[PDB]
Amino acid sequence: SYKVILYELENFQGKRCELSAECPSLTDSLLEKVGSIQVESGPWLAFESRAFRGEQFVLEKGDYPRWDAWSNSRDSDSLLSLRPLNIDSPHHKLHLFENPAFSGRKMEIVDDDVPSLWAHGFQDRVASVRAINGTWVGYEFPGYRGRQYVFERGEYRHWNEWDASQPQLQSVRRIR
Amino acid sequence: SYKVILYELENFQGKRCELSAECPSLTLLEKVGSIQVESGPWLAFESRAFRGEQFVLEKGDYPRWDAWSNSRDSDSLLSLRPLNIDSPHHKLHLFENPAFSGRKMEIVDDDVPSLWAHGFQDRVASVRAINGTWVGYEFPGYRGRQYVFERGEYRHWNEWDASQPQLQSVRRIRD
Amino acid sequence: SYKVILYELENFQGKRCELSAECPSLTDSLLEKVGSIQVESGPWLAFESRAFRGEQFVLEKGDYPRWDAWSNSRDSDSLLSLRPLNIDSPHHKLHLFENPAFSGRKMEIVDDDVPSLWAHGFQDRVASVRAINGTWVGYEFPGYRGRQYVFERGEYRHWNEWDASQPQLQSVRRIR
Secondary structure: OOEEEEEOOHHHOOOEEEEOOOEOOHHHOOOOOOOEEEEEEOOEEEEEEOOOEEEEEEEOOEEEOOHHHHOOOOOOOOOOEEEEOOOOOOOOEEEEEEEOOOEEEEEEEEOOOEOOHHHHOOOOOOOEEEEEEOOEEEEEEOOOEEEEEEEOOEEEOOHHHHOOOOOOOOEEEEOO | OOEEEEEOOHHHOOOEEEEOOOEOOOOOOOOOOEEEEEEOOEEEEEEOOOEEEEEEEOOEEEOOHHHHOOOOOOOOOOEEEEOOOOOOOOEEEEEEEOOOEEEEEEEEOOOEOOHHHHOOOOOOOEEEEEEOOEEEEEEOOOEEEEEEEOOEEEOOHHHHOOOOOOOOEEEEOOO | OOEEEEEEEHHHEEEEEEEOOOEOOOOOOOOOOOOEEEEEEOOEEEEEEOOOEEEEEEEOOEEEOOHHHHOOOOOOOOOOEEEEOOOOOOOOEEEEEEEOOOEEEEEEEEOOOEOOHHHHOOOOOOOEEEEEEOOEEEEEEOOOEEEEEEEOOEEEOOHHHHOOOOOOOOEEEEOO
């Protein structure tokens, strides 16, 4: 059901690695450093560091000829672990909160994407989140730009729970 | 020496998965619905590679996720391992502020169901686990989210994988 | 090219485990608890926890007869994963910053080690780092003491990016 092809070099050149399952460490046997990717069946969630840590990259089906094709930010060219991302959800519901522990101003998003949180009274601060239904991806900047943070069904009482160092988010969309 | 049986559904129904060693990713079973710990304790985790919310699993029966989890942060359980608790003594130092600063409390071979009984409020910002394995909780009487402290030093609440320094009770992991 | 020998007991006694590749868990049918280490060919980057998490220990070539020989901080006696560390760099360039997102006072270090950041206008605070060339290791206390944090070539916009809970650093050196 899932398949990703990772290449040692840019433009789908060099050593080729096909994966149909999660990989907690790409340097364990597979590649030295991922240069390009083809997602044949996904989506996949890729990570800058080993064991599904560090910066996140949602990889939909398609071609990524270089690291700047999957990184919407330019913080890191490292990709060391990745896994299939379960997106089997008919409805999407997300609650964003101004302050930690689901306190302060609240924004509810239902079966829609938000390219700018500013259009709904928020600033560039999201300090707790409730992903009621579906999988979502939040971004640092408007129009789905900068670093990505994935929200799967569950509660996030503080920005550290979604692996962010700061509560800055300016756009969010459903993974579908 | 260790053995856990995980079931796909609640009340020990559906597909089974027997483990006698750590598992960094349960992906084998779609979603754990119930657990029988035959020989433990085990330390279970909401996420892969021993990350996310923690659940200490002593020997016994857990017919549904709310039997092992006290919070609503997740029903997901994706990794788990045997927890070594072979320690004759237990010593824990709790600190008010990060980097072992401010008010200090020492706990020796005892459990504390309310930190408020010892002048601590609900703020623990650094910890020293001198001897033994401990488990701290958000609320008094060992309620809410759990955080395991194995022997070592924690200069900030993020070191024990907490987003905030709130703790109100703590106990030793022992039989 | 890489080789580490791990022993069950102190002073290179008990059961042995030889590794020439990364190991995400030393308790997964290898050893009960590492008591001593010989690095035959390195350097290696070791970790307190499984899956390359927790406190870091840079292990150069040589003999470590007890846990407190590799841990320059009486933090933990635990060592559960480790990997070879690539240090193939002819030059070393590091930029340290006072505040996150490469803001505030800046220190540039070129092909040199700094046993005290205080000797160059910093306090015990480093909140973002640019590792332009080479691999580096930062420490909590002056003279390379306390907990270690490895910096590989790349950008670190916040202290959490190098897996620190706080921006306290007082010395830094090249891994060579």
